[PDB]
Write a protein that binds this ligand. Structure first.
Ligand SMILES: Cc1cc2nc3c(=O)[nH]c(=O)nc-3n(C[C@H](O)[C@H](O)[C@H](O)COP(=O)(O)O)c2cc1C
Ligand SMILES: [Cl-]
Ligand SMILES: [Cl-]
Ligand SMILES: [Cl-]
Ligand SMILES: [Cl-]
Ligand SMILES: [Cl-]
Ligand SMILES: [Cl-]
Length: 308
């Protein structure tokens, strides 16, 4: 039923459309992970997105340590984020902070889980102080789900750390500000058994929305057929479901038309097309992104892509 251009209620909010910006690590923060003024201009240029999900933002001092990627553990970081959220809000948009913790697959000790929960609580509270609208927790096979550490065996235990993290964040900022991204096919580029229960569990926690990264495409040469995870996620997950990966305008609208997705997030297209929604609306050609400058440290290939 809905158009990509229709508003959408989620959490405490109404996004102005269902063309959202996916989280994108860009490396324009300082070496010691402090946000910079240039990031404010970049996010504001893209505030026509119904919701911006920030770049991965570290929750603990040592455990990032991608330099030039931001964190949110410190007061200096909270202060440096304020210009960015303020610029998005001055442009009428919305912005969630993606909180990042690096996990290992089958490293973290049982005795560090309480510190981890505390780090997430604190990052979520700092995100509010920084003026973000909410936060997105990222989970994937290495990461809160089947993380290398009672956290094994029954599905319940395999998703336990994710549940505990999500409950702590909700206790801190409210379920209406708390979202999750599931990446069942991996993070950077068995499943059914665990991601469908992860999604039912999150639904029962009544989080604001779920992001799921799953190839738009059905039919790939040399690949044997497996059914999509998304229609199964849609059955157990009641709040809004936002799909991601390789969507075009046409396949995005098709997903809304089918009922499986309420909104779609676009990553790479927002790198070179800050006004993606308007290009889609006008059927304008897209500007090609320059892969070379995805993770460099300057405005070039960052804030110098023109608006229509
Ligand atoms: C430069 C770049 C940075 C990305 N950074 C993140 C990130 O910080 N967090 C995350 O969960 N995914 C990240 N991704 C994955 C994207 O959010 C998205 O899932 C992927 O690019 C597929 O969607 P798209 O085809 O619309 O680009 C990144 C992708 C790229 C290309
Ligand atoms: Cl709605
Ligand atoms: Cl700066
Ligand atoms: Cl971290
Ligand atoms: Cl501090
Ligand atoms: Cl709430
Ligand atoms: Cl692209």
């Amino acid at each position: 039923m809905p158009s990509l251009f229709d508003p959408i209620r989620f959490g405490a909010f109404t996004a102005k459309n269902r063309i959202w910006m996916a989280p994108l690590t860009r490396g324009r923060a300082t070496r010691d992970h402090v946000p910079t003024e240039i990031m404010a201009e970049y996010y504001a240029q893209r505030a026509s997105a119904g919701l911006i999900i920030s770049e991965a933002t570290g929750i603990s001092q040592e455990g990032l340590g991608w330099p030039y990627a931001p964190g949110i553990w410190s007061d200096a970081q909270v202060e440096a984020w304020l210009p960015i959220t303020q610029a998005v809000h001055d442009a009428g948009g919305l912005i969630f902070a993606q909180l990042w913790h690096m996990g290992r697959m089958v490293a973290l000790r049982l005795d560090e889980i309480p510190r981890l929960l505390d780090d997430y609580e604190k990052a979520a509270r700092h995100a509010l102080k920084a003026g973000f609208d909410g936060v997105q927790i990222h989970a994937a096979n290495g990461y809160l789900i089947d993380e290398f550490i009672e956290y094994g065996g029954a599905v319940e235990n395999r998703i336990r750390l994710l549940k505990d993290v999500t409950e702590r964040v909700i206790a801190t900022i409210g379920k209406e500000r708390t979202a999750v991204r599931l990446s069942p096919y991996g993070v950077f580029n068995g499943i059914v058994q665990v991601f469908i229960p992860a999604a039912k569990m999150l639904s029962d926690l009544d989080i604001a929305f779920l992001g799921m990264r799953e190839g738009a495409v059905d039919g790939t040469f040399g690949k044997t057929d497996q059914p999509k995870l998304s229609p199964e996620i849609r059955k157990v997950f009641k709040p809004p479901l936002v799909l991601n990966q390789d969507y075009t305008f046409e396949t995005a609208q098709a997903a809304l038309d089918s009922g499986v997705a309420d909104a779609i997030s676009f990553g790479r297209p927002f790198i070179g097309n800050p006004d993606l929604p308007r290009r889609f609306f006008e059927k304008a050609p897209l500007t090609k992104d320059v892969i070379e400058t995805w993770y460099t440290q300057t405005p070039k290939g960052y804030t110098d892509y023109p608006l229509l």
